[PDB]
Structures are given as structure tokens and as C-alpha cells.
Amino acid sequence: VDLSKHPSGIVPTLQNIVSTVNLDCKLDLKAIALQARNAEYNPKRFAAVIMRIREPKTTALIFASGKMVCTGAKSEDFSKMAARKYARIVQKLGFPAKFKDFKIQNIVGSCDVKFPIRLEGLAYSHAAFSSYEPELFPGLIYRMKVPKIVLLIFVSGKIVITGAKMRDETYKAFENIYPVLSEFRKI
């Protein structure tokens, strides 16, 4: 691990990265639909071709403006990589693909404290940051001060930390909340 950086001794495993990239070229979704084959375009529900590729297992939403969105990648670089492969596809279809403006927009990651948690004590103690309605969702939606990431503590110890643009914010969240989780460990 690296107790200097992950004092908890647990390092959140990244689970889904969402990045956007602007191809510049105005796309013909109608066209792109007809030959892509790994795509899926339905003007009906969603106004964007939905193409997917094996390795890295990602999914892209492509709009007739050049703007693409890559989701599913389990890593930035991988999100980036796949985003290139999409452009090269659009490119190999007859379009002026340009990899302008690529950016990481959200890093979803998960974790396991390995001990059950007394959510109510946490929901009660961090009133300002927690929302725990078993009636609406079985998780305690915690909203961290800094960084501005949302965690979703559960009774089992599994954590889910969303909202990060930089994988390190993800780490800064967990280490922040870990000694709160430990305090409310189930007896």
C-alpha cells in the first residue's frame, strides 16, 4: 500500500471514469449508425450514437457536434485510450476527427472497510453531512466537506465514493471519512 498516503491501509479501487472529448468534426449520426455496427442509434430515445468497444470495455455517446463522452473505463488513462479508439473509429468512417479538449469529469470508486457500520450513530453524529432514510435508499449518503465528493456508506463496510475529477480527491475523501467509519464500527 503506502501508509504515508493511504493511512487507512485501504486504497479505493476505481470503478468507472467519465470523460468527455470534442472531435471537432460535425458528425452524421444517421451515417455513423448505418456502418458503425458496434454503435446503436435511436433518434427516438437518445439523440447520440451509443457505440461500445471491447477493451477497454467502455461506452460512448456521440453527438452531431463532435462532442463524445466516454464512460465505463476503469481508469483515466484507459478512459483516455478508449476515447482515442472512438475517434479513430469515427475517423475510419470518413470524419475530420480531432482529439480536442479531452477531460476527466467524474471518478467513481469503491471500497470495503471490512467491518459493519452503525449507520444511525454516524447519521446522527454527522447530521450536517449525512442523509439516512432506509425508506428511500439503504445507504447513508454522506456529502463530504472537502473534497466535494459524495460517499455512500452502507452497514457492511462497502463504501462508494463519487464526484471526483482527480483520483486523489477520491483518496482524500476516504481517508477523511475512515476514522469516522472506524469510530462507528458495529460493537
Partner: protein, 204 residues
């Protein structure tokens, strides 16, 4: 928008039998979610419902989301959503909701005696005290406990009868019930009666 909103609030209140207290407080909440609003495109009677939800609970007497909805039209979703929005807006929060919170009402609609109520209420607390039902919704636990209690008395009610009033589903009630059944003995009151004894309670 506001006055006519209160027109409906009262209608809501009445249908589910709410006295002046929460019925007034819900208007006071609603008037504020107009001043200290930020509830923009939200239904005015969604802001209302949620208010007559955050109200019942602040009065120490809450009813399930399903209960408000069944006097509302605005989905459980929206009342769940504007509810969250409203607490944040107004910088306020509530108290959690527990086993012995719906026991009074659930039992009255179920038409059971004080005997059954008390035991269900003691079972549910020990179910939790004994951590027998880890991540179960308190409503579920309660409806479960109410089934153990009642089934061990004369005045019994079925899972479809309990589920129907608790606002849960037999499947779900079965889930918690079966989780607490193995501790049935340690869960009852002690001085509990017993038209049917524990060794006889439905295993489920």
C-alpha cells in the same frame, strides 16, 4: 400558489386524520419554502406534501412516505426528493424513525389490542437491540414483529394484512420475520400471554 397550496394541505391533513399541530406546522414550513425557497420547478403541492411529511416527523409522530402519498398524487419519489431538498434549504433535519414509531398506528388500523401492540413493540426493540435484522428498513422490522406478536396471540393478522397497513410487502415481512423467528423466545415480553406458543409460531 401559496394560499391554494394550503387549500390542498388541509385536504391532505384531513384525509389521514391530522389535528391542528402538524397541519399548521406544514403551512409554516411551506411558507418558508417560498421565502427561503430554491424549490424552483417543483410541484407546489409536492413542496406541500414533503412539508406535510417533514412536519409529522418533527412533531414526533411520523407516517411512512407511502402514507402521505396515499393522500397526495405526487409520487413517493418527489416527496422523497423535495423532502431532502427542503431539509437542506431550511438548514434543518429530523430524528430517524424507529420500530416503535408506527406501532401505535399500524396496530390500530390492524385492529389489535394493547396486548399485541406492546409485545410487537418489545419484540421489534429487542430485534434491533439483538442486531437480528442488520440492514432492514424499520418499517419492515416493525411489520415483522407485529406478525410475530399477533400470531402468538388470538387476534392474528396475516402478512397480507400486516403488509397492507404497514405499507410493505409480504415477501419483505417474511424476510425480516424469518430473521427474528430464531430468537422468538428472547424477543417476547416475558409476561406475554400466548394463544399459540413459540414452538408453534409459523417458521415462515
Amino acid at each position: 400558489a401559496m394560499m391554494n397550496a394550503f387549500k390542498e394541505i388541509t385536504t391532505m391533513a384531513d384525509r389521514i386524520n391530522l389535528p391542528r399541530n402538524k397541519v399548521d406546522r406544514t403551512n409554516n414550513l411551506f411558507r418558508q419554502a417560498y421565502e427561503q425557497k430554491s424549490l424552483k420547478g417543483r410541484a407546489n403541492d409536492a413542496i406541500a406534501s414533503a412539508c406535510l411529511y417533514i412536519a409529522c416527523r418533527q412533531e414526533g409522530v411520523p407516517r411512512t412516505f407511502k402514507e402521505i402519498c396515499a393522500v397526495s398524487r405526487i409520487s413517493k419519489k418527489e416527496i422523497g426528493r423535495c423532502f431532502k431538498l427542503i431539509l437542506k434549504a431550511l438548514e434543518t433535519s429530523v430524528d430517524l424513525i424507529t420500530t416503535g414509531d408506527f406501532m401505535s398506528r399500524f396496530c390500530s388500523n390492524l385492529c389489535l389490542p394493547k396486548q399485541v401492540q406492546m409485545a410487537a413493540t418489545h419484540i421489534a426493540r429487542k430485534a434491533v437491540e439483538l442486531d437480528l435484522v442488520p440492514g432492514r428498513s424499520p418499517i419492515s422490522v416493525a411489520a415483522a414483529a407485529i406478525y410475530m406478536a399477533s400470531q402468538a396471540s388470538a387476534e392474528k393478522r396475516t402478512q397480507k394484512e400486516i403488509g397492507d397497513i404497514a405499507g410493505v410487502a409480504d415477501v419483505t415481512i417474511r424476510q425480516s420475520y424469518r430473521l427474528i423467528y430464531p430468537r422468538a423466545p428472547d424477543l417476547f415480553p416475558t409476561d406475554f400471554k400466548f394463544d399459540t406458543p413459540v414452538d408453534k409460531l409459523p417458521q415462515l
